[PDB]
Coordinates of C-alpha atoms (C1' of nucleotides) in Angstrom, one line a residue:
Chain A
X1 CA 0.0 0.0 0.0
X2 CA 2.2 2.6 -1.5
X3 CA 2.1 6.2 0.7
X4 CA 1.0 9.2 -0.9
X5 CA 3.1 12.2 -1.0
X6 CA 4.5 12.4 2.6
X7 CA 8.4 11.8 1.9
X8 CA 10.6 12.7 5.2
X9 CA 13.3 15.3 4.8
X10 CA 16.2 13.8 4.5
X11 CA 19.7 14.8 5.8
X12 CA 23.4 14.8 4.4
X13 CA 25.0 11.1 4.0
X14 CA 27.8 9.7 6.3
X15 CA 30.3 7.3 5.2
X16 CA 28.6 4.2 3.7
X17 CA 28.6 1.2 5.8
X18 CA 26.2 -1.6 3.9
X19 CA 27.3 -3.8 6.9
X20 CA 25.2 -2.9 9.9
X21 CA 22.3 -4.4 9.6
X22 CA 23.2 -7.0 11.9
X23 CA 22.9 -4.9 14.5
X24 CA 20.7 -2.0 13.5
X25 CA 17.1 -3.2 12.8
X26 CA 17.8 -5.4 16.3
X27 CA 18.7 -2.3 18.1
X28 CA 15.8 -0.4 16.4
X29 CA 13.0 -3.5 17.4
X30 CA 14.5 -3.5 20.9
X31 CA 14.6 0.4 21.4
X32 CA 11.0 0.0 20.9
X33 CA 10.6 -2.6 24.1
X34 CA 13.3 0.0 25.9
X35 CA 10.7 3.4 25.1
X36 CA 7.9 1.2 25.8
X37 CA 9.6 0.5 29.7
X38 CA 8.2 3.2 32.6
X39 CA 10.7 2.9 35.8
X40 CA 14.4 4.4 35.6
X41 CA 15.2 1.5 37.9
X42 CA 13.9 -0.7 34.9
X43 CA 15.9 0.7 32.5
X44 CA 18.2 -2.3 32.4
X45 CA 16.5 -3.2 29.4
X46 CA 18.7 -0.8 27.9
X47 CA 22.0 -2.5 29.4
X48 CA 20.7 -6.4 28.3
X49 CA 20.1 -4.8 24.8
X50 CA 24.2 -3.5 24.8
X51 CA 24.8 -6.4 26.2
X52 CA 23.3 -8.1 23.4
Chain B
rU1 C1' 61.0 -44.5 63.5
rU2 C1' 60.6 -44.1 68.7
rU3 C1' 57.8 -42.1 72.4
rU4 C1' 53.6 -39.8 75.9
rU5 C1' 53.1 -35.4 84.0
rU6 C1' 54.8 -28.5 78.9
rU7 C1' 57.8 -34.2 86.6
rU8 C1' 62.5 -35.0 88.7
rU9 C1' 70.9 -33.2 90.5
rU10 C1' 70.8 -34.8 95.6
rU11 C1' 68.3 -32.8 99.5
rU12 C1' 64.1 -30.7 101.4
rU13 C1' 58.6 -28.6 102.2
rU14 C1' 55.4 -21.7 107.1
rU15 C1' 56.9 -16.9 100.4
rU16 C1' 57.7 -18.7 110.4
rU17 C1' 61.3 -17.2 113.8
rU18 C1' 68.2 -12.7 117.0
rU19 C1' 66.4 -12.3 122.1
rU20 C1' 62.3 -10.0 124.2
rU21 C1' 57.5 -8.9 123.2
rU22 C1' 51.9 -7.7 121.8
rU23 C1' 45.4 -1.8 122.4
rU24 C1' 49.3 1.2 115.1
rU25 C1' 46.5 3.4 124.7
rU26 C1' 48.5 6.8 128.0
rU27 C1' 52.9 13.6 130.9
rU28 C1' 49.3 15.2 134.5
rU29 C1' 44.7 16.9 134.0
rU30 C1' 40.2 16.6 131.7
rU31 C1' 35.5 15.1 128.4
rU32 C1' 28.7 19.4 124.2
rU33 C1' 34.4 20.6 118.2
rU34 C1' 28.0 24.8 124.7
rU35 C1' 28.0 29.6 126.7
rU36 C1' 30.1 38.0 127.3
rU37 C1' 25.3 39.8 128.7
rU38 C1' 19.9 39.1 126.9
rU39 C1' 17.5 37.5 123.6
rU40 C1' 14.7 33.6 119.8
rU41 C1' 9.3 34.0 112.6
rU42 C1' 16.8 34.5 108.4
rU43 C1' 7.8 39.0 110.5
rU44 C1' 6.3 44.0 110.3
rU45 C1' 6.7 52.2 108.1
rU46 C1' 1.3 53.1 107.6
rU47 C1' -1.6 51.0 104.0
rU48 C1' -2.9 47.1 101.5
rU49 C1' -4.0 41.6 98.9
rU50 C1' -6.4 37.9 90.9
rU51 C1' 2.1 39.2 89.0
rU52 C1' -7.2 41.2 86.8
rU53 C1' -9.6 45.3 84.0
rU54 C1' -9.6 52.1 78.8
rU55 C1' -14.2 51.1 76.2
rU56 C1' -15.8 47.3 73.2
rU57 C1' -15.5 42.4 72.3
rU58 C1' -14.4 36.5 72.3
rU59 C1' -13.4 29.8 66.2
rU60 C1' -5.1 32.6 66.5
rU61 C1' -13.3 31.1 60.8
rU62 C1' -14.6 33.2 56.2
rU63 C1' -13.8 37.5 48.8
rU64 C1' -17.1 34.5 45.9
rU65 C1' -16.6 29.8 44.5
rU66 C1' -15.4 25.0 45.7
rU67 C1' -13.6 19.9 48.4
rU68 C1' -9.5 12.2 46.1
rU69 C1' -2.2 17.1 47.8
rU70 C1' -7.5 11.5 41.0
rU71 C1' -7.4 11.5 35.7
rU72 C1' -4.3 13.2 27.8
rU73 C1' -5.7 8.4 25.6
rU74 C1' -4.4 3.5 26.2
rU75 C1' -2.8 0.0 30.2
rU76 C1' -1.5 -3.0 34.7
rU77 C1' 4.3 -9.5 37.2
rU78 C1' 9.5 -2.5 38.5
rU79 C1' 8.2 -11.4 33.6
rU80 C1' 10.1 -13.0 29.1
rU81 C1' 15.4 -13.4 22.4
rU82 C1' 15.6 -18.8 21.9
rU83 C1' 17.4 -22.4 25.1
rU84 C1' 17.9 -23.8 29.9
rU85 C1' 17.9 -24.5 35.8
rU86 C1' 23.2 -28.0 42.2
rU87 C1' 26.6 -19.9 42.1
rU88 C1' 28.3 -29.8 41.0
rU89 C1' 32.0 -32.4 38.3
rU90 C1' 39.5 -33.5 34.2
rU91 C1' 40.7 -38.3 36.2
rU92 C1' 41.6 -40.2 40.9
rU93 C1' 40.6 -39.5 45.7
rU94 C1' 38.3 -38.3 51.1
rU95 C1' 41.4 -37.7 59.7
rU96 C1' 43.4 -29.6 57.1
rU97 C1' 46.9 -38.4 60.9
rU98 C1' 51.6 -40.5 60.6
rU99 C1' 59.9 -41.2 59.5

RNA sequence: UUUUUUUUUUUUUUUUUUUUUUUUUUUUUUUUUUUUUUUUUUUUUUUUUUUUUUUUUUUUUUUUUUUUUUUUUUUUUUUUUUUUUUUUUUUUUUUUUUU
């Protein structure tokens, strides 16, 4: 289902990797679960997902 | 290995003794750490007796409203990658015993 006419405004490119995605997607997924957490003192989620 | 009082020279056995002694008593007197005399509330000028009082007052109550120091919405293990579950294990051993 194709989006109409609502691109994001883009920003200058950095040096090209083409290698990250083995970490990237999983740390974007798991940032969700880490924003989705509601204690300070439960914000070891954060340190299992560097661990990770 | 050997041993088994952290016993022992032989003597001895009151951390007793010159002799004399025995109130860490005594000059003789004495014996309220009493006393000039006379006094005896560390009472008193006369008044006086709420460290009460201007009058008025008397929630150190009140603008009107109000009355979870509740609430975006959604939610409700300050659970979870999967797998697991003696902060067990080389093997051999098992008085931190022994000449």
């Amino acid at each position: 289902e194709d989006i109409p006419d609502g691109l994001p405004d883009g920003k200058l490119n950095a040096e090209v990797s083409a290698e990250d995605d083995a970490w990237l997607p999983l740390f974007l997924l798991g940032l969700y679960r880490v924003g989705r957490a509601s204690e300070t003192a439960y914000r070891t989620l954060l340190m299992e997902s560097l661990i990770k």
